[PDB]
UniProtKB/TrEMBL annotation, chain B:
Residues 1-54 form the TCP domain. The chain holds residues 66 to 120 of 415 of the full protein. This is Transcription factor PCF6. It comes from Oryza sativa subsp. japonica (Rice). It is found in: Nucleus. It comes from the Eukaryota.
Length: 54, 55
């Protein structure tokens, strides 16, 4: 249930707010991914331009 | 930890893969947020252009 990160040990489970969970699951359905983790990974990839710009 | 949706009940807890967790927490750290949910909120706004292409 845990993972090493550069800033220390963290939980693999993250708790979404009600409002964010509603939006996230709507997106997971639209993307068609079976595992919610893959929709999170997709978001990280799709946000690359904003992430690059800090 | 349950959320109700038009499609039924879902869990507010999401289990990340090891690799996705490492990437996600690096982003959360770069953003400076202390709640993971706010980083996901940020991502949905930051990915808006791609989401809008989903047919």
């Amino acid at each position: 249930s845990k993972v090493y990160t550069a800033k220390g040990i963290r939980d693999r489970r993250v708790r979404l707010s009600v409002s964010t969970a509603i939006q996230f699951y709507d997106l997971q359905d639209r993307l068609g991914y079976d595992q919610p983790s893959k929709a999170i990974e997709w978001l990280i990839k799709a946000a690359a331009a904003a992430i690059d710009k800090l």
